[PDB]
């Protein structure tokens, strides 16, 4: 039940709230107060999803859709079958995400680690909040948020994009996509480099950090470095959502036209017509 | 009977935490589910009837 | 006219009232 | 009538969907998780209820060991049979009888090396360059390395502890000669004839001085000692870093307590 | 049970009432006895 | 030796106070619910077409 | 040496309190379900055209 | 801390008793539910 | 079975009722005997 | 009753703060749910009946 | 009989917690699936019957 | 004959867990697949017949 | 030491109980399938136009 | 089999019933015999 | 024969696991492939005949 | 050995493995005959087929 | 085979049935022999 | 000949696993490519004939 | 040996590997003949073909 | 071969049959003869 090196690290303390009340492990999982709240929200939200799906038109796993209220309801609580279940599950999801992040804070305090992982987890939480809370607040109702369903939230993404006639021309989207592609490519490069150094071939020697620097200085003329590649990976992954949020929040509240026309700021400069 | 020996291995703290979570979630689930119906909602004015 | 003799009032009274009794008669 | 049809309601894409899932889950469960089990396994149950297989046999969840042939010398295996057992007699007592119950230090955890102050049983060898020289060395022993022009030189700066009390003076920087990266500050600690290394990550450095939230000034005296003056072993690096990390949770009792 | 005008008058004699009671009462009894 | 530090005298004191306070809180909740019922009897009788 | 830290006597005391609490909780659940049934008999009899 | 033979026998006895009691009350409950809703309908007229 | 008007009257004699009972009753028996 | 021994293993202070947070959340849920109905809303003008 | 020896290698608590979670999931699946039907839903007014 | 030696190699604990998971998966596949048909669905009112 | 940690005697006892349980499960499956066939004879005879 | 009305009357003599029984019964025998 | 020497290099546990997975995948492929045809589906009402 | 089996364990496992594989394939042959009796899946060459 | 009315009557004598049996039987035999 | 010397070099484990995967992929390709045609499909009712 | 065996186990493995491969290919030949009897899959040159 | 009504009668004498056999049989031989 313990890793062979684990026992010396399982010490008390580091909790944000609860102290010794919930400071314990269940199998490998650390629990804590926010582990308790995470299990509460997870069980409640998944059970509400289950019951609400049972009352929808299809029970095919990919066709299940729990949708927010109509726009007319504004911010009011909706009848459960007409958006109220979506509201409850949204609240449960937010509680679960925040509980998970805070439990990560407690775990990293216990291990003497930097808080980089819960802080990084803050970014997708913030994007979820932009999609489901902040932009709906600016647009004037919970009905602007995305529904819960494997394929139905894709329908929402699709129609949201085409509400601005081509979402590809959104500059925030262009930045976000560039970071997504750069991050996937950089992860491929980094995993490949570490594996190549540790696994040269048949009976060949594990190489060194100088070999890591030499490989990329040969191939592209630059090597960012061992610590710096992890910094860069975190930077690119975070900037996917950090720069996407600007395009998302702007679409509607700050821009009602097609996104291609936004580039009129450049195209229509009077100097070059 | 030796049923009490269960508490020599099962840690009342973790058991009580789990049962508290479990029962509260199930109670909330059942109340929500009933309030979502027409036939068994006890808060709202009755609907689903002619 | 909601009164003490409304039958359905026993339902909230039963859920609130029964445990309050044995809570005081078991743990105390 | 249609390309891609295999029956009335069977088509190629439908089968390829399940084939894709098979590829994904075979790679994950049959290969990747086995790779994940090359450290810390087989698992141990100090307070278990049942008998597990002996730690010295290939018990089924264990991958077959692979051999890393080191650049400068011998071989290591993964899983490593020599790192399988840990023997240090940790100064920790149970707060409760079960394994899921946290342990409590029996006194001075930072010195003992438990919790966030735990250090791993690394090899007691000096990490080296690909040319065979010691990788991490003070600038006094590596005159060919220097601070880049116009960057803050921290030698001569006062070092203050977490309590704002002055703890020492920076005497040297330790550079990683393979990576060209500064990794340690050497500190002459006030009140003794003794130097303490500190990872550069625990230092907030300004032109006025360096500040260390991790430990109190008085605790700089108990930093683990290097056996040699101008080189450091891997285990020594672990011990020195873990001392300040343990201070992050143990420097004062308040640091181990919750907000509410 | 149904009244004359099709109206509901619940009682202990409703057969369907013994589905919940059975599900709730039966374990409650043998939980009280088995682990005593 | 107790993980909370209580001394079986503090524990008995807290248990007495806590059980009394829980029963008291449930009782005032009961009274408040009765007042609310006199304002709004929230469990309506079975409607005519209900089955 | 117990995994839970409880002695034999504390295990027996906890067992008695736990089983009593569980049985009382389930018994008040049974009573409450009966009262609710008198308010709303939730399992309707087999309707006319039901197969 | 490992389980002893006596403890193993005691747990096994109670575990089997609990499982059998659970399955038997499930059997009775399913009979009652059948009396409320006979859920496996007979073969319909055109069923082949 | 079906009543004189086609309405269903559940009973212990219903043939299909012995599918669930059989699935639940049979293991319950041999779990009890084989193990303790 | 030996029930007081529970407080030798549960730390009354932490139990009370967790219970306070839970009960606050439940009370907010119930108040808001009632205010989301026509029949039992006590803030708004009576809606949902002729 | 020797079946009790299973508990010397299988960790009774693992079986108990696994069964608890597993049977909870199965019971929820069955209840929700039944409520999804017209013929066997026992909460709402009867549907799918002319 | 000597088939019992399989449990000196194959780890009864892992086999029991794997069989539990596997048979659960197969049973769920069959039950839900049958429920997805008209002819062999035993929950809903009969579909697909004249 | 065996790979599983069992002894030869434990291996034999587990093997006997495992085979008995497996055979009993398969046999009750056979009986249950016959009963389900009496409810729903799921393999229909070759239809008229079938080839 | 098919009755005079044509409705299916499930029976033990149904030929197709021995596809599942055969698939289930046959291994159950030799599993019970090869390993015992 | 010397075929038994295969198990001195092939790790019977992993062979048995891979064979279990392989045969299960083939069986699911065939059963659900046949259920995906009109001609050889044995669950649904017959389709594709005049 | 590389797998940690002895010689006689390898021989016994090989014997039982081959017997089990042969019995599985033989019952597959019998089952395929029975299924053919139910559904003769390889139809004769039809009228216009070339 | 094709009955005189033109309907299918499966039998052990159908030629096509020996495509699967042959595919299943032939290896089964030599697997039984080669590795014994 | 020197053919056997290949197995002093070529790692028979890797060869067998790669060959098993290769042949399985080819067999799947052929079976399902044949089913993709009207002419050589043996599962479904005959299609594509005058 | 550069890859594990004992220079005679390699001869044995080569012998069995080649015997297995030949048996597999030969039964494939026979099976292809049987399939041809069922479906003569290489049609003669059609009338207008060039 | 082709029959009177144009129906195909497969046989060992079909010429095209020896394209697959050729592709299969020829390597099988010079493998078995030359790599064992
Ligand atoms: C809703 C949320 C449900 C969460 C349920 C949690 C239940 C955990 C539990 O009961 O554990 C008891 C168990 C008891 O602990 P213990 O008795 O101390 O340990 C016994 C063993 O000695 C120690 O065992 P071990 O450490 O060797 O365990 C390995 C681990 C194996 O874990 C994994 O394999 C993780 C798989 C990663 C999936 C990667 C997905 C990415 C690739 C696909 C991407 C798709 C793109 C489109 O666990 C398992 O063996 C499988 C557990 C089966 C339950 C999974 C549900 O604790 C655990 O085993 C912890 C592992 C649980 C990990 C959860 C993995 C969740 C994966 C879901 C995502 C998949 C998406 C598809
Ligand atoms: C080409 C590209 C190349 C690269 C380009 C450049 C790279 C850029 C990216 C670089 C990598 C990312 C850098 C992030 C570094 C963050 C870090 O080092 O944190 C470790 C550090 C660990 O602390 P420590 O040294 O262990 O503290 C001593 C003890 O823990 C004693 O601590 P204590 O008990 O005194 O602490 C009490 C604490 C108690 O605070 C809390 O418990 C609340 C924590 C909340 C959870 C974290 C939420 C983070 C939300 C982020 C959302 C991101 C998206 C939002 C939209 C933008 O209250 C606070 O310290 C401040 C309250 C909020 C803290 C957050 O965490 C912090 O102290 C807070 C740093 C936050 C700064 C950034 C926040 C954004
Ligand atoms: C949590 C607690 C929830 C309790 C809910 C109580 C409730 O539903 O009231 C039923 C109550 C009983 O009505 P009922 O006779 O069953 O229904 C027939 C008509 O509705 C009755 O005719 P009405 O609607 O004109 O009601 C007349 C109203 C006349 O009462 C007044 O003069 C003003 C009421 C108190 C003003 C605010 C009190 C602030 C001090 C606390 O109430 C009385 O007759 C009681 C007179 C004695 C003064 C009560 C002061 C008690 C304070 C403790 O209906 C009311 O309209 C009285 C409302 C009482 C004030 C509302 C709650 C005040 C909370 C202040 C918290 C400050 C911190
Ligand atoms: C026709 C419409 C289109 C469209 C509509 C669109 C919209 C409206 C938006 C984007 C956005 C985005 N698009 Mg774009 N899209 C992108 C890629 C992207 C992303 C880079 C970016 C951010 C995604 C995001 O915010 O997820 C959000 C993901 C979140 C929030 C994850 C939250 C996770 C949570 C915290 C944790 C959840 C945990 C689980 C519940 C737990 C699971 C438990 C386990 C155990 C089972 C590409 C590469 C392309 C291409 C190839 O053309 C494209 C085309 C389109 N997009 C179409 C043109 N897309 C967003 C953006 O930033 O735009 C500027 C955005 O708003
Ligand atoms: C820019 C940085 C990014 C980033 C970063 C990081 N990501 C992290 C961490 C960091 C740093 C962690 O530390 C944390 C973790 O532990 O990792 C292992 C985590 C995790 N990232 C997950 C999912 C994930 N990351 C996505 C995106 C990015 N991640 C981007 C790219 C996406 C996308 C894009 O779809 C997904 C789906 C989980 C696997 C895990 C959270 C577990 C959780 O929260 O537990 C608590 C909650 C649950 C286990 C379930 C809660 C279920 C609710 C109650 C009911 C469902 C509600 C829901 C709204 C329904 C949706 C329906 C759907 C069809 C529409
Ligand atoms: C092990 O650590 C790692 C490094 O340091 C040793 C890397 O340099 C790298 C390579 C990363 C980089 C060089 C930065 C990312 C940019 C890349 C790969 C291509 C961009 C083009 C250039 C850098 C050319 C610059 C020339 C001027 C990786 C992936 C890594 O994992
Ligand atoms: C825990 C909290 C965590 C997550 C919950 C988050 C909930 C967010 C809700 C979003 C909005 C929901 C909208 C809604 O549906 O709110 C109301 C119902 O929900 C409701 O309160 C349901 C409220 C349930 C009340 C009963 C709860 C009793 C539980 C007791 C056990 C818990 C005790 C735990 C103590 C530690 C609406 O009532 P309806 O009868 O449908 O009215 C329909 C009318 O509009 C028609 O005209
Ligand atoms: C959290 C998950 C929530 C999803 C919903 C879970 C609720 C349980 C639903 C049980 C459904 C039973 C069922 O029947 O499952 C079948 C397969 O679904 C399925 O695997 C449903 C998916 C089951 C996943 C279980 C995994 C464990 C679906 O067929 P039907 O429902 O007839 O088709 C619905 C239509 O006829 C419309 O009326
Ligand atoms: C669990 C296991 C699940 C595993 C499933 C795997 C099953 C894969 C089956 C793929 C079979 C592909 C064979 C295609 C084929 O055999 O088709 C042939 C042509 O292929 C052509 O050109 C060329 C066709 C090939 C194009 C390239 C396709 C690449 C991707 C296909 C496979 C991806 C699978 C990925 C799995 C992760 C013959 O077709 P025609 O007679 O001209 O058509 C006539 C029809 O219109 C009328 O009847
Ligand atoms: Fe890395």
From TrEMBL, chain A:
Binding annotation for Fe(3+): 190, 230
Residues that, per the record, bind ubiquinone-8:
190, 223-225
Where is it chiefly localized?
A: membrane
Q: Name one GO molecular function term.
A: metal ion binding
Recorded coiled-coil stretches: none
Return the PROSITE patterns for the record.
REACTION_CENTER
Specify the protein's topology with respect to the membrane: Multi-pass membrane protein
* GO BP terms: photosynthetic electron transport in photosystem II
Compartments it resides in:
Endomembrane system
Matching Pfam families, A to Z? Answer: Photo_RC
**Regions crossing the membrane:** 29-53, 84-102, 114-134, 177-198, 232-255
Keywords, in A-Z order: Bacteriochlorophyll, Chlorophyll, Chromophore, Electron transport, Iron, Magnesium, Membrane, Metal-binding, Photosynthesis, Reaction center, Transmembrane, Transmembrane helix, Transport
Keyword set includes Secreted: no
- List cellular component terms (GO): endomembrane system; plasma membrane light-harvesting complex
| Classification via InterPro entries | Photo_II_D1/D2_sf (IPR036854), Photo_RC_L (IPR005871), Photo_RC_L/M (IPR000484), Photo_RC_L/M_CS (IPR055265)
Q: Which family does it belong to?
A: Belongs to the reaction center PufL/M/PsbA/D family.
Q: What does this protein do?
A: The reaction center is a membrane-bound complex that mediates the initial photochemical event in the electron transfer process of photosynthesis.
NCBIfam families from the xrefs?
pufL
Name of the protein in its database record: Reaction center protein L chain
From TrEMBL, chain D:
Q: Which Pfam families match?
A: PRC, PRCH
GO CC annotations on file: plasma membrane light-harvesting complex
Q: Enumerate the Gene Ontology biological process terms.
A: photosynthesis, light reaction
Q: Which InterPro entries match?
A: Bac_photo_RC_H_C, Photo_RC_H, Photo_RC_H_N, Photo_RC_H_N_sf, PRC-brl_dom, PRC_barrel-like_sf
Where does the Photosynthetic reaction centre H subunit N-terminal domain lie?
A: 5-140
Q: Which residues carry this modification: N-formylmethionine?
A: 1
Q: Which residues cross the membrane?
A: 12-32
Keywords of the record = Membrane, Transmembrane, Transmembrane helix
Q: Which residues form the PRC-barrel domain?
A: 153-214
Q: Where is the signal peptide?
A: none
Q: Does the keyword RNA-binding apply?
A: no
Q: What name appears for this protein in its UniProt entry?
A: Photosynthetic reaction center subunit H
Q: Which source organism does the UniProt entry give?
A: Blastochloris tepida
UniProtKB/TrEMBL annotation, chains E, I, N, Q, T:
Superkingdom as given in the UniProt entry: Bacteria
What keywords tag this UniProt record?
Membrane, Signal, Transmembrane, Transmembrane helix
| Bilayer-spanning residue ranges | 16-35
The molecule here is called: Light-harvesting protein B-1015 gamma chain
Source organism: Blastochloris tepida
Automatic annotation (TrEMBL), chains P, S:
Q: Name one GO biological process term.
A: photosynthesis, light reaction
Q: Per its UniProt entry, which superkingdom is the organism in? A: Bacteria
Task: Identify the keywords attached in UniProt to this record, alphabetized.
Answer: Antenna complex, Bacteriochlorophyll, Cell membrane, Chlorophyll, Chromophore, Light-harvesting polypeptide, Magnesium, Membrane, Metal-binding, Transmembrane, Transmembrane helix
Q: Where in the cell is it found?
A: Cell inner membrane
Q: Which residues form the signal peptide?
A: none
In alphabetical order, the GO MF annotations are: bacteriochlorophyll binding; metal ion binding
Bilayer topology reads:
Single-pass type II membrane protein
Q: Which residues cross the membrane?
A: 16-36
Assembly, per entry: The core complex is formed by different alpha and beta chains, binding bacteriochlorophyll molecules, and arranged most probably in tetrameric structures disposed around the reaction center. The non-pigmented gamma chains may constitute additional components.
Membership in a protein family: Belongs to the antenna complex beta subunit family.
Protein function: Antenna complexes are light-harvesting systems, which transfer the excitation energy to the reaction centers.
Q: What is this protein called?
A: Antenna complex alpha/beta subunit domain-containing protein
Q: Which organism is it from?
A: Blastochloris tepida
Query: Source organism lineage?
Result: Bacteria, Pseudomonadati, Pseudomonadota, Alphaproteobacteria, Hyphomicrobiales
